[PDB]
């Protein structure tokens, strides 16, 4: 009886970051392993950035997915969470150290030897665009029954992005007023994370156009155009905080530091672009504070999905075939998707 | 109403040149306290303040947010101060009392501060500490605890408050926490000795070689690092659970700083602004880590700042001078020239 699990995933072979088929093996499921068929895998800007090598994290061969919805067809003996049947989902990690201070306090994200989905080098592995996956129990998320996962499964990286910061923040918390910086994944998001948390959201977006979803679709409180010099003037000391989901450098620090209150803090989670501008008075005068933040911990991760599932929030998706996977990295590059292209791994990806 | 006749020592214009400036100070009211200075330390930012560096301040100007002194009278509803208690006044007199920082104790952010030196941060006319009599709202006036010297210790007002405050925020004054210290002047020595008595390590970054000996022996410095050894500095990468940097806004490269930060490590931004840091994203997201400033400290921390240095019997070394050496200080002061900060002896030199 032939025991290995046969997977494949799609990614790059090479540096050239061709899109293509990657067939490879998943290990047998040890006592403690659940193995996972995938319905639906997210794709964002992350992964379109990382197949071609961006940041210089990527190991070829490439297979990315750090989103990933499925279900569960097998359980190792010992394993108590899950049985057959269950929905589930993993996020961007699927092993780390277990004994350091981080591991121990439920940050693993910021162990220093964390086991990424998609082996990213910030054990070699291939992420969740792929057909199967074998992880253990502890790095498996509890579908929340109410939420779909081809709209919900963006959440696993919008939703934990910005929800880990504002609860590392104190941020929240009824009452509190937050902006947010550029209307995609994230942003959205944390709109209406922000709303559903008893606070206020105000949007700065370079899009116009997005005036009408901001306010009628997410709840934002406040729409503002990043050129409305005079309003932004307005917003001077209004924020409790402020998250960047923008390419890091492309907006202003001085702008985010004047929309803050007292005590304040920016909340960095854009890719760096470029080197952000400082000035120290605003935190000086003010005891603002920048902060930056990556993914989030294990439970912050399954908080996130029963906070959204109890709210009913999802991410605006467009749920395609993996056939179209070319032209989605071309969208997503181009900011034409409304907001994340989640991937039908379950209907449309075959064998040979 | 005015009454008591004073003399301080600032500037009565841009220009600078240090004087005597003739005025009177209101009759005590029901809650004010009236202080007989003894001691008013001077440092950098009001070497920089007379000459107006910064567009704060308004002529004519007597500095002085370092004042030490004893009480001679008390208004009828004053019961906190006796006549004959030693006393301090820092760089507040005043604050709107009603805003959610005032409510928390936190008056050095009210919008509206009523600065001693009557600096622009609106606020009332004043002149500040380097004068020979004081009249103070209660509420702004510190407790000398006895075991501290105010010659020695008056820096501390200063010195002290400016690196405890941010300290305690963060929650770094613990045990068992590595914090580097950039520069090795009044704040940086200062810090340093927080450090220590708070059960910290405490390494220095300083642009003096010869500081090396005091950092170590005088102030008890686990390390001591030149700024320009990149080799040491590299093999501190990830070691520190928070960084004060007490040199001017941007001398001090903020990469280098972020990169000295362990896992969720603070840099603390107190120095005076002087140009644009150059902030990368990428440390602060992969370590998050956090840039936070800061400013003085509420009455309470200034309070409570004092109260653990003489615990700890703590001082800012301090060059003891009279009144007429104000200008050489002054210059001893733009040039890194004394060790680490002068205290004016007002009670005995002016008149
Ligand atoms: N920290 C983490 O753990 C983490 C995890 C995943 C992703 N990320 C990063 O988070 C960022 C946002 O993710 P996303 O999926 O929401 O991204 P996205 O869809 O690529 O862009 C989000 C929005 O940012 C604004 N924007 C994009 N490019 C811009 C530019 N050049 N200048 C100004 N504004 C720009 C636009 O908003 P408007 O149309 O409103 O202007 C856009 O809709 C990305 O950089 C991504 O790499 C971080
Ligand atoms: N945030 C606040 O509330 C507050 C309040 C008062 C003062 N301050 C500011 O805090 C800072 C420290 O005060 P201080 O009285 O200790 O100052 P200081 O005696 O003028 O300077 C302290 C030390 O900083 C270093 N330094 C000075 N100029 C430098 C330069 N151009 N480049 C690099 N390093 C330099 C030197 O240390 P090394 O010899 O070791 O290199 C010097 O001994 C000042 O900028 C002061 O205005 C802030
Ligand atoms: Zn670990
Ligand atoms: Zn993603
Ligand atoms: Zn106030
Ligand atoms: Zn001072």
Not at 97 to 112: A, K, W
Not at 147 to 160: N, S
Not at 209 to 228: L, M, P, Q, S
Request: with cysteine.
């Amino acid at each position: 009886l032939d025991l290995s699990v046969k997977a494949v995933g799609w990614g790059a072979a090479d540096a050239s970051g061709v899109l293509q088929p990657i067939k490879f093996y998943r290990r047998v499921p040890g006592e403690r392993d659940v193995k996972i068929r995938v319905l639906y895998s997210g794709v964002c800007n992350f992964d379109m950035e990382m197949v071609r090598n961006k940041w210089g994290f990527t190991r070829y061969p490439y297979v990315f997915g750090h989103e990933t919805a499925g279900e569960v067809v097998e359980v190792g003996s010992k394993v108590e969470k899950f049985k057959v049947g269950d929905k589930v989902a993993v996020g961007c990690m699927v092993g780390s150290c277990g004994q350091c201070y981080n591991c121990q306090s439920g940050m693993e994200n910021y162990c220093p030897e964390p086991n990424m989905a998609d082996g990213s080098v910030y054990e070699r592995s291939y992420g969740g665009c792929s057909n199967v996956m074998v992880v253990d129990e502890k790095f498996v998320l509890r579908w929340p029954e109410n939420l779909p996962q081809d709209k919900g499964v963006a959440l696993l990286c919008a939703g934990v992005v910005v929800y880990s910061p504002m609860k590392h923040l104190g941020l929240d918390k009824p009452g509190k007023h937050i902006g947010v910086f550029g209307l995609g994944g994230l942003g959205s998001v944390a709109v209406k994370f922000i709303k559903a948390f008893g606070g206020k959201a105000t949007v700065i977006s370079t899009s116009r156009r997005k005036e009408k979803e901001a306010i009628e679709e997410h709840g934002a409180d406040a729409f503002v155009v990043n050129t409305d010099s005079e309003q932004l003037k307005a917003l001077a000391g209004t924020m409790d905080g402020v998250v960047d989901t923008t390419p890091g450098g492309r907006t202003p620090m001085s702008l985010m530091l004047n929309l803050l209150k007292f005590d304040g803090a920016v909340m960095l989670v854009g890719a760096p672009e470029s080197l952000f501008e400082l000035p120290a008075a605003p935190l000086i005068m003010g005891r603002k504070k920048i902060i930056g933040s990556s993914t989030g911990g294990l439970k912050e991760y399954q908080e996130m999905l029963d906070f959204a599932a109890k709210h009913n929030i999802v991410c605006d998706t467009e749920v395609i075939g993996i056939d179209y996977l070319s032209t989605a990295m071309e969208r997503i590059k181009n900011l034409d998707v409304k907001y994340r292209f989640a991937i039908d791994i379950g209907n449309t990806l075959k064998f040979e």
